[PDB]
Amino acid sequence: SDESLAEKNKNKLQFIEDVTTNADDVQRRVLEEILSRNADVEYLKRHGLEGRTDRETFKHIMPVVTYEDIQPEINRIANGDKSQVLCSNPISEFLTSSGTSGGERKLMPTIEEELDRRSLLYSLLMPVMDQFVPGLDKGKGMYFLFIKSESKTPGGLPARPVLTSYYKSSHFKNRPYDPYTNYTSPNQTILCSDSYQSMYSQMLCGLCQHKEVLRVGAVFASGFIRAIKFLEKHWPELARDIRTGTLSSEITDSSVREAVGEILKPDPKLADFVESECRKTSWQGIITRLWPNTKYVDVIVTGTMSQYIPTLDYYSNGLPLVCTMYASSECYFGVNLRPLCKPSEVSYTLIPNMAYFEFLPVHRNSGVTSSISLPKALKEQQELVDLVDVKLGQEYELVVTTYAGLYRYRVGDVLSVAGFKNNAPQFSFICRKNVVLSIDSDKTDEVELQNAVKNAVTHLVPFDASLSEYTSYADTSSIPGHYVLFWELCLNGNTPIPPSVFEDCCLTIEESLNSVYRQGRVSDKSIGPLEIKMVESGTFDKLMDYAISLGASINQYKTPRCVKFAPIIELLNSRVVDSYFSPKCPKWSPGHKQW
Ligand SMILES: O=C(Nc1ccc(Nc2ccc(Cl)nn2)cc1)c1cccc(C(F)(F)F)c1
Ligand SMILES: Nc1ncnc2c1ncn2[C@@H]1O[C@H](COP(=O)(O)O)[C@@H](O)[C@H]1O
């Protein structure tokens, strides 16, 4: 079995070599299967494909679509149309993207067979890693994994995030014993409907088995950071449970009590140890004191999660940060072939079996923007670029055809070719296009921010005052982070504006933001209350003065809706007068509002 572990790792690696070497043959083979299997579906037939399966006809005939283009089809399916609308296979469920249309979560169709390709990509992760850090099979992994809120569409189909349906699927719930997926969190502890009990029991099991832990993490840095904050707010009770060997009576779930009972045993010496480390004024490096055998931290810190690297580096004492894979609700994408690289060097290799990948060349106005446009010498020729044909150093937007009824759908991700593994390109992740604010899974764009602020400023009309200018940033100085707005008012009124109405503005912004933002505030507690900081009169003029000094024409300058440049955020913060916070949670409820 030690041997058949090595054999298995050698095979998964040889698969990487074969699929990256044969990537176009695979991409052609995948497409040919999707259009063969789905030739009589309504969507393809309606576009005149006539059951043709060749890449050349497919690119020439099918339109490149956004989610809003195909919403009719998706909504009919989510209303119970069980005909072969987009897929020849029944849509098993809908996977709810964190990206939104109309403030509501986008509904990505999937089919049951897609669970295999997802496990396939997961199955690549430890074989790759074991190359660089051997011996992880002799240990456990402390990962805080969580199910999230879940819904039913009008037609009856489930609607839930990928990981929720993955964690509940047979592929995970009854998974075969893998010594590389030997976690300190028991299943029933992850599958717990109650998120507090789920976090409480996972932390207890992590501390209980603290010396077996060779890696820690969560899916996102934000989530793992919230678990450290939890240990900070709950270590006396947890130590007490370890000491007495009994689980807090507040843990109701009998699944969990049973599960925790297998691990938890009275350990006064371990309680003393937890306490002595948590009691220290500094938590710098506490991860490697509590879990001293930890070899790395397994959290995504690419994309907007990059803001969390310093807080991570503080708690881990500069342990390596490891970003293993890249994926979405519509499709699992690729693998990091160099897991021990610096976060700003991470490249993802798309596995050509997951879907048929296409690439639309894009051009950004700077390296800092999440805003797109189309090159001059490049939306009439939607004869895009194929996987093997992307060029080193160029940026593209990601396009995907999936087994489950997406044809040439724009994911909305911007990638940059950083290199190649054999013939398969490796992408550095740039951004999800138009996102300007993000703490956890929430992804707010400028349009949403703008319309939220337009709603908010109506509370000022009674007082004969207005918003001259504003900007925002994502404040991660606290756990959880929050959105900050900088407001400069114009006051032409003789009733002073009571503080309650600035709070009314914070709430009104929050209520206008999408349902992922609101679910974060209401359910996930992944986002703290919005803040509005009022700045001295003249502040945005002083900004514009910088811009002009540096080359800008006045009749063209526009105050950015969002800023992430630390020195400019620091300047704005220097001219703050007061700050106001949302006084309660916005409204959120599971599902689309129509339901
Ligand atoms: O899934 C992701 N990371 C992940 C990695 C390992 C494990 N651990 C497992 C898995 C399977 C089994 Cl069988 N055992 N252990 C769990 C989750 C991921 C990554 C990037 C984006 C997204 C998405 F949400 F945006 F799609 C998801
Ligand atoms: N490893 C990663 N690094 C940066 N961003 C990621 C990564 N994985 C997923 N994402 C982002 O999250 C999206 C998927 O969101 P969702 O559909 O909500 O699961 C992707 O399309 C990317 O925008």
What is the rounded (10 degree) CA torsion for 207, 209, 210, 213?
Answer: -130
Residues 6+ apart with CB under 8 A from 245: 264, 265, 266, 267
User: Distance between CA 19 and CA 26 in Å, rounded?
Assistant: 7
Task: Report the candidate in 344, 474, 359, 366 with the shortest Cα–Cα distance to residue 414.
Answer: 359
Determine the distance separating the centroid of ligand 1 and the alpha carbon of 324, expressed in angstroms: 9
- 353 CB neighbour count, 10 Å cutoff: 16
Nearest CA to ligand 1 atom 24: 328
Nearest CA to ligand 1 atom 13: 172
| Residue type present at position 542 | K
| Residue type present at position 172 | F
Sign of CA dihedral 65, 70, 71, 77: negative
Question: Which SS3 state, helix, strand or coil, does residue 349 take?
Answer: strand
Q: Identify any residues that bridge with 578 across adjacent strands, giving them in sequence order.
A: 534
- Which residues precede chain breaks (C–N over 2.5 Å) in the chain? 378
Closest ligand 2 atom number to CA of residue 412: 21
Nearest CA to ligand 1 atom 4: 219
Nearest CA to ligand 1 atom 3: 219
State the DSSP string of 416-445: EEEEEETTEEEEEEEEETTEEE-SSS--EE
Question: Which SS3 state, helix, strand or coil, does residue 124 take?
Answer: coil
| Residue type present at position 202 | Q
Determine the distance separating the centroid of ligand 2 and the alpha carbon of 15, expressed in angstroms: 24
CB 231 within 8 A of CB 238: yes
Q: What is the resolution of the experimental data for this entry, in Å?
A: 2.4
DSSP at 590 = S
Task: Report the candidate in 474, 479, 523, 475 with the shortest Cα–Cα distance to residue 231.
Answer: 479
Q: Beta strands of 289-375 (E only): which ranges?
A: 296-300, 321-322, 325-328, 331-335, 348-350, 356-361
Sign of CA dihedral 21, 37, 159, 411: positive
Ligand nearest to the CA of 215: 1
What is the rounded (10 degree) CA torsion for 409, 415, 419, 425?
Answer: -10
User: Distance between CA 29 and CA 45 in Å, rounded?
Assistant: 21
Structure tokens at 265: 């045993």
The CA-atom distances, in angstroms, between 305 and each of 1, 17, 301 are 38, 30, 5
| Residue type present at position 349 | T
Task: Report the candidate in 270, 136, 256 with the shortest Cα–Cα distance to residue 186.
Answer: 256
Determine the distance separating the centroid of ligand 1 and the alpha carbon of 244, expressed in angstroms: 35
CB 522 within 8 A of CB 588: yes
Q: Report the Cα–Cα distance between both ends of the chain, in Å, rounded.
A: 51
DSSP at 84 = S
Closest ligand 2 atom number to CA of residue 325: 1
Ligand nearest to the CA of 164: 1
Determine the distance separating the centroid of ligand 1 and the alpha carbon of 401, expressed in angstroms: 21
Place of tokens 């502890």: 189
Q: Identify any residues that bridge with 326 across adjacent strands, giving them in sequence order.
A: 334
Structure tokens at 578: 């007061």
Structure tokens at 574: 């220097």
Structure tokens at 103: 């403030």
Angle, CA of 79, 356 and 325, to the nearest 5°: 90
Residues 6+ apart with CB under 8 A from 254: none
| Element holding 185 (H helix, E strand) | none
Structure tokens at 316: 């881990």
CB 215 within 8 A of CB 339: no
Q: How many helices (H) and strands (E) does the chain have?
A: 21, 22
CB 76 within 8 A of CB 85: yes
Structure tokens at 210: 């603290």
Determine the distance separating the centroid of ligand 1 and the alpha carbon of 129, expressed in angstroms: 15
Nearest CA to ligand 1 atom 12: 172
Question: Which SS3 state, helix, strand or coil, does residue 333 take?
Answer: strand
User: Distance between CA 337 and CA 347 in Å, rounded?
Assistant: 8
Task: Report the candidate in 245, 251, 241 with the shortest Cα–Cα distance to residue 275.
Answer: 241
Determine the distance separating the centroid of ligand 1 and the alpha carbon of 219, expressed in angstroms: 6
- Lining ligand 2 with CB less than 6 A are 97-99, 300, 302-303, 323, 326-329, 411, 413, 429, 432, 441
User: Distance between CA 299 and CA 488 in Å, rounded?
Assistant: 38
Q: On the CB side of 61, how many CA atoms lie within 13 Å of its CA?
A: 17
DSSP at 521 = I
Closest ligand 2 atom number to CA of residue 431: 23
Determine the distance separating the centroid of ligand 2 and the alpha carbon of 547, expressed in angstroms: 33
Task: Report the candidate in 320, 263, 313, 274 with the shortest Cα–Cα distance to residue 297.
Answer: 320
Determine the distance separating the centroid of ligand 1 and the alpha carbon of 452, expressed in angstroms: 33
Packing angle of the helix pair 566-574, 539-549 (nearest 10 deg): 140
Nearest CA to ligand 2 atom 13: 328
CB 200 within 8 A of CB 186: no
Residues 6+ apart with CB under 8 A from 549: none
Question: Which SS3 state, helix, strand or coil, does residue 581 take?
Answer: strand
Q: What experiment produced this structure?
A: X-ray
**326 φ, ψ to 5°?**
-140, 130
**264 φ, ψ to 5°?**
-70, 130
CB 502 within 8 A of CB 531: no
**225 φ, ψ to 5°?**
-60, -35
Q: On the CB side of 25, how many CA atoms lie within 13 Å of its CA?
A: 6
DSSP at 183 = B
- Under the phi-then-psi rule, with left for phi > 0, alpha for psi from -120 to 50, and beta for the rest, what region is 191? alpha
User: Distance between CA 15 and CA 123 in Å, rounded?
Assistant: 11
Place of tokens 């409480």: 200
Task: Report the candidate in 148, 158, 138, 152 with the shortest Cα–Cα distance to residue 199.
Answer: 148
User: Distance between CA 116 and CA 119 in Å, rounded?
Assistant: 5
Question: Which SS3 state, helix, strand or coil, does residue 228 take?
Answer: helix
Nearest CA to ligand 2 atom 20: 328
CB 479 within 8 A of CB 521: no
DSSP at 153 = -
Task: Report the candidate in 143, 147, 305, 280 with the shortest Cα–Cα distance to residue 222.
Answer: 305
The CA-atom distances, in angstroms, between 508 and each of 449, 480, 501 are 11, 20, 10
Q: How are beta strands 93-101 and 158-160 bridged, if at all?
A: parallel
